[PDB]
């Protein structure tokens, strides 16, 4: 079967730069041109670059302005993307694709059939950081609908996963996109609304996983 | 460059609706014009190509049309996995662009938020920061307001705020917004409230703590 894997993705320093690469494999890699497509959180699709079959034809986007080469080896089956002066409005995650199959020596038809599955790329001064995960609970000064939570507070980069007592509590569970605050760092909510009368009875702990920073955090959430 | 536009920018419909979305271009790109759907936090997936070519293992409900510069997409039977944004993309020259995007969400009766606010943890006030947080709990449609208020005074600049994806059953939104102070400013003030105005409210609705 078609296969394009990527990898290269992390985090980078404004100006600095980063090599993406995608490893092809199940089709013959040289008899199609390939593009790279981005897309930063929350926002659309964004064209970037084309190489073609041969690499003999390669086209940019606007905003790349020379700062970025597409490039591949079709000995090695491999597609690569070098970015050069990166800049924070280049944060997205990065796919490369190429067109549905075709007999043909070069199959170069601008249709994304066959996409990869995505690495993100962060560019910001921030460091890379685990979250503190603080509880959310209401105010101590009982009866209704309550809502619990916990704010996972000040990481670096996405994503951080969470649940709710290792899965099992799944029902009235919300969990929220990150904001990017003016630090130039993300945080996140996530809650369950329970009866009032459970706090007393049952106990709630949220699971925090930050993977960049090998952070995981099981918090407590007590009234 | 080509401009690529779509209409509408987003679009409630209802599971058996037929969906008619257009696209245009800034110039003659023939057939040229693909079409792809995104569901939230997945890979896109080619749907329709050459304007009008249903893409290989792809149903009969979904259809393109047009040539030149204005397309049409179309959904027979609005199904629930099809709730995502589609995009249009064009390959006359380079570069290669999309469309802004159609985002489809499923329509329901309006539904206002319950609401709830949170003080800033005790672990959290261990340092110099405060982050008070706000909940709007599974209200429709996804308009809300929030007004962060201290001691009475209206904040600005200090608050973010997210929604999440629509829910999948019941067809509702829910919004979670942080108010960031200084442990300083928190420790001197008294009474903090989020205030929340929604379609379904016949006035404002105000929770509130006092530290």
């Known amino acids: 079967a078609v296969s394009l894997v990527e990898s290269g993705g992390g985090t980078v320093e404004p100006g600095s730069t980063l090599r993406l690469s995608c490893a092809a494999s199940?089709?013959?890699?040289?008899?199609?041109?390939f593009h790279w497509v981005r897309q930063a959180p929350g926002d659309g699709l964004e064209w970037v670059a084309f190489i073609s079959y041969n690499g003999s034809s390669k086209y940019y986007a606007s905003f790349v302005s020379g700062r970025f080469t597409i490039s591949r080896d079709n000995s090695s089956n491999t597609l690569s993307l070098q970015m050069n002066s990166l800049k924070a409005s280049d944060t997205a995650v990065y796919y490369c694709?190429?067109?549905?199959?075709?007999?043909?020596?070069?199959?170069?038809?601008?249709?994304?059939?066959?996409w990869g599955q995505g690495t993100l790329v962060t560019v910001s001064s921030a460091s890379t950081k685990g979250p503190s995960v603080f509880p959310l609970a209401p105010s101590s000064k009982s009866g209704g609908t309550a809502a619990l939570g916990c704010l996972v507070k000040d990481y670096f980069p996405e994503p951080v996963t969470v649940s709710w007592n290792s899965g099992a509590l799944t029902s009235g569970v919300h969990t929220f996109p990150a904001v990017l605050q003016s630090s130039g760092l993300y945080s996140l909510s996530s809650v369950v609304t329970v009866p009032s009368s459970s706090l007393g009875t049952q106990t709630y702990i949220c699971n925090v996983n930050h993977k960049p920073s090998n952070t995981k955090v099981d918090k407590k959430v007590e009234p | 460059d080509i401009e690529m536009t779509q209409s509408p920018s987003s679009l409630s419909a209802s599971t058996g609706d037929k969906v008619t979305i257009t696209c245009q271009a800034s110039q003659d790109i023939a057939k040229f014009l693909d079409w792809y759907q995104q569901r939230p936090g997945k890979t896109p997936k080619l749907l329709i190509y050459?304007?009008?070519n249903l893409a290989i293992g792809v149903p009969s409900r979904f259809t393109g049309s047009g040539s030149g510069t204005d397309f049409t997409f179309t959904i027979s039977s609005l199904q629930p996995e099809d709730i995502a944004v589609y995009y249009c993309q064009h390959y006359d020259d380079f570069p290669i662009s999309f469309g802004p995007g159609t985002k489809l969400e499923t329509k329901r009766t309006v539904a206002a938020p319950s609401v709830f606010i949170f003080p800033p943890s005790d672990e959290q006030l261990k340092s110099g920061t405060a982050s008070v947080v706000c909940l709007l709990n599974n209200f429709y449609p996804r308009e809300a307001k929030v007004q962060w208020k201290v001691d009475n005074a209206l904040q600005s600049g200090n608050s973010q705020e997210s929604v999440t994806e629509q829910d999948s059953k019941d067809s509702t939104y829910s919004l979670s917004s942080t108010l960031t102070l200084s442990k300083a400013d928190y420790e001197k003030h008294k009474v903090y409230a989020c205030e929340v105005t929604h379609q379904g409210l016949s006035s404002p609705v105000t929770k509130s703590f006092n530290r």
């Open positions: 199940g089709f013959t890699f040289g008899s199609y041109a």
């Open positions: 694709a190429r067109a549905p199959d075709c007999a043909d020596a070069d199959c170069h038809k601008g249709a994304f059939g066959y």
């Open positions: 050459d304007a009008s």
